Every structure is written in C-alpha cells, then in structure tokens.
Symmetry: D2
Subunit: 162 residues, 4 copies
C-alpha cells in the first residue's frame, strides 16, 4: 500500500484505482496527502516543505463542531464566530469593536451602533478598541447620539447648534 505508516488501502472497483484508507490522524486524501478538516499543513510536502498537520489556530473563536473552519493549507480561519474576524479570528468584524481575545463571548465584539444623525457621513464603523464613533460638531456619546449640554437639534444631521 502506497500509504503512510498505519494506513491500509483499497482497490476501488468503479475505476480500478488504489486509495488509502486508515490515514494517520490529522491527514486525509487518497494518499493521506491532505490534512483532515480542522487541521492545516502539508503532511507529504506536496507544495513546499513537509508541514505536519496541526489543529486550526483561530484563537478559540471557531465552532468546534463546524466544518471548514480553516484553510487546510495555510491555516487561515474561515468561519470566525462571535463577530470576530481577521486572518486568525483576531480582529472584530467591520462595524464592530472590542477585544476578540476576551474570554467571555459577550465581551468580544459589540456592534458600533453609531447614531446616523450624529455620526460624520453616517459611518457605521467605530474605533476598533474604544468603539467611539466619529461625531459631528457638538455631538457626544460613544454612538454620537446626543448633543453637548446646551446644544440642540441633533436631527439637523449636521451637529447640534446653540
């Protein structure tokens, strides 16, 4: 059998070709040349040096029971949860802010929720760490949703006036 240590093989009938069957854990493919789902690397050096298959590294921000969580070759996370994003689920989705590495799911990424009347050009994204939205003149609040004390007419859509 043209398969790694442990792998048994089978002569398929539907085309008459041999394929590996008990590929070592972490690898898959007809020759156990691919990494299994949930893993990434290049077990047989098919595309560069040999890279042992290892579990995806997505800062624990992926569903353990989902499939296709990461690119089997590069390790790029594909199914980041909790509104996280980035190559390794280490950023927040655009329009969100917080700390993707915060251990409690609720504290990872919260929506910017920028008030459209007070935010410059009605932007939907805010500072990624503080969440501060970019406010029009004399508007205040993280979401730019209220006028500064003594100013009025937020709905002017151009800042508050005295």
């Amino acid at each position: 059998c043209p398969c790694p240590g442990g792998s048994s093989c089978a002569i398929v009938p539907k085309t008459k070709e041999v394929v590996c069957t008990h590929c070592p854990t972490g690898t898959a493919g007809k020759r156990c040349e691919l990494c299994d789902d949930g893993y990434f690397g290049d077990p047989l050096g098919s595309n560069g040096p040999v890279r042992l298959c290892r579990p995806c590294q997505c800062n624990d921000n992926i569903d353990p029971n989902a499939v296709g969580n990461c690119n089997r070759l590069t390790g790029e996370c594909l199914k980041c949860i909790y509104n996280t994003a980035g190559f390794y689920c280490d950023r927040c989705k655009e329009g969100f802010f917080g700390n993707p590495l915060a251990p409690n799911p609720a504290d990872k990424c919260k929506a910017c929720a920028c008030n459209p009347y007070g935010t410059v050009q009605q932007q939907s994204s805010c500072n990624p760490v503080t969440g501060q939205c970019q406010c029009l003149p004399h508007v205040s609040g993280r979401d730019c949703g209220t006028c500064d004390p003594g100013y009025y007419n937020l709905q002017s859509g151009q800042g508050c006036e005295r």
Copy 2:
C-alpha cells in the same frame, strides 16, 4: 416550551416528560442547561452566575474531532495531545520537555530520554524548558549519556572516573 429562544420541545412517551430539542448552539441538555461538547460554561446559571458557553480553550493542543476534550463546567482540558499536559494543555507531560505552545507539533514536547547510567537516581524527567537531565559526576550531555573528556566507565552507574 420550557426552553430558551429557538428551542422547540417534545413530550417523550417512555415516561411522559417534556424535553427541549433545538437548543441554541453551544448548549445542550433537556432544558439546554448544559454546554454542548467542546464547550464550557453555565448557560442558565445552574451552579453560579450565568456563564455563556464558549469553545474549550486548550491552546489548540486538542483533537478537533475528539469528544470530551474539556470539562463542560470548568473548561479544564482533558484530552491534551502532542505530549502536552496541564490545566490548559500548556505544560508538557511529565518526562517530556519543550514548549507546548510551539506551533509545530514536533517542537512542542519531546521525551527526556535520560540515560539511566548517567542520570542521578535513574530519573526519567528532565528540566521542562532545556531538557537537561540531572547527571552523575563527570557525566555530560543533555541525556547524561557520555563521560566528560578523559573520564571512563559510564556503566559504573555512579559517574565516570579518571
């Protein structure tokens, strides 16, 4: 239905009791009061404050396709792979050394392999970072497997002599 948002329920016949069926993702149990496998927390505050279920945090040193990787309540990792160990797969098994957080599986934890003739009291464990074994007099090497230059008789089991 006495179940969280989304969960449907079913009146079982075999005892005539209702149980939840479409528990929100991450939770499980007849009332979706437990965290699903691969997750940990306390969704309904059954044993302390409410703790949203989150994927186990085992420094990516657990098989994504195994079950029971961590304690569903505390998050303690139970099935650490690559010879890693510790509460969160952040140490190496006893008798191993290296860096459990090293990204390549081969560089995480290697066996001490202390030479029994040169190691003090025939110990099997070595320094967890350097891997240095504790050597008898005039013995050298990480594994204490050879005499210092000019000394002889390692098999004396008491160090080399001149």
Copy 3:
C-alpha cells in the same frame, strides 16, 4: 575584540582584562554571552544549543518597568503581577481564582475569601475557575457564608442545623 558583531571592547585597568561593551540588543555580559534583563535564551550556546535571546513570555502579566521579571536562562516568570502565578503567569496565586489571561486586571485573579465558619477545615483556597469554596453541611454561597434556607447557626463551625 572577542565580542559579537557590533560590540566594541575595553581593557579594564582594575585587573587588566578585556570586556565587551556594545553587545547586540538582547544580550549582555563581558562577552555578550548572557541575555539582557527582560530577555531569556543562550546567545552563544554556553549551556546547550544556541538560543537567541527573546523578551520574557509571561502572558503580559509582568511590570514592563520592573527588573528580574524572568529567569534569563529558562524564561520562567519570576515577578507575576495581579495575583497571577505559575511558570508563565498563567495560573492564579494560591487562595485566588479566575482567569489569569483575562485582559482586564480586575478580572484576572480575585481572592477566594472563604468564610471560615462555613468552609470545610477552614480552607483558604477555592476552585481556581469558579471560586467555589468547599462548604460544610447545609451551608451555601461561593464563600460558604450563609446557611441553606431553613437552616440556622452558621457559627456552629460545623454546618447549619434545622
């Protein structure tokens, strides 16, 4: 000069010995054979293979402005702050509980504060994750500080009685 690339040296007068002076960043010592404070490794392979000096890895739980934060050879963290502890400031001090890796200093490690009247054998340590103290009969609360509903006399020091 018997010193690495860049290092200049000086013939000291007080004993008449040469010593290196502009050791490359991260290293120190008369021959730049040690790693500088805040770093760990073995730049010249003086005690095993060459290990480039790198900043201590203490999960950001060390004072950036303190000295001696980690062992210059092994990297073992020595001055863990915020009540954190363990080889790499990845555990909580004994008698504390929480998540040493929690990003907010206040959420890392909190004191067990076990009530001495309700805790078994007056223990001071609690579960490292939940903080639950070990309670005597019919005593409840994380700190074991109150009787179960309908029980009395916590100060009995043996659990509450009906």
Copy 4:
C-alpha cells in the same frame, strides 16, 4: 492632594500649580490620569469608561527596554520587532512571511526575497504563511528563482521557454 490613593502632590513654583507625584503604579500625569509608558487604559475615565492601566499586549514582540511600545490609550503596538507588524505585532511586515507568534525570533518573520526575474510584475511580497512568491510561466521555487526542468532563460523576465 487632588490625587489617587497614595499619590502625594507638589505646588510647583514656576507657575504655581499643584501636580501629583506618587501616582499608583501603571499611571502617570499631573493627576495620574494617564497610563504610564508600557501601559494602556484610562485610569480616571477621562475619555470613556474607566479602564485600568495594563501592560501593552503585543504578543511579546516588543523590546522590554524600549519606550513608546504602545499607544497609551488604545493599546495599539507601535514598536513591533523581529519584522513583525499589525495592530498587536501579530502579522509580519509587508514583504515578509512566517508566524509572528513563533517563539524563536528567527522563525517569526523571514524576508520574501522574491527573485525579480521570475516573479510576476517583480513583486516583493509573498504569501504571508508559505512565503510562496507569485511566479511567471514555467518558473519554480518559493522565490521563483529557477526554471522548471527542461525550460530555459529565466532572465527573459517573462518566464522560461523550452
């Protein structure tokens, strides 16, 4: 003294204004309203909620002995070393590839070194994980520096020909 617990203060002569002097560790400023260098947060809630000052979180890819390693308000890493980059020194500089989180400084980020004759449009950047450069027709190698077996003339600057 208009200063936090522990801080003493001084009436300066050069303008006659009081300023705090023994600010609690991690904070600084005339009112201990700023986080000290090497730290980030908002101790007194001067720009949003109170955020305890904590050491910069730059994946240990910053010089412990440098100043201004991170933004005192947001925590954005400013002086990433070892060719690392990104908000938290968690990417590699452009034109580099590897794993910024690799514990050995040498394995973090290596230069793409794309061969200009074999790389498409003479690009200098390569795949961030594999380092593979984008090669012209019939050119091979990570750096696109040699022709496929049986092809010739790499210096054509358009791929090799048979």
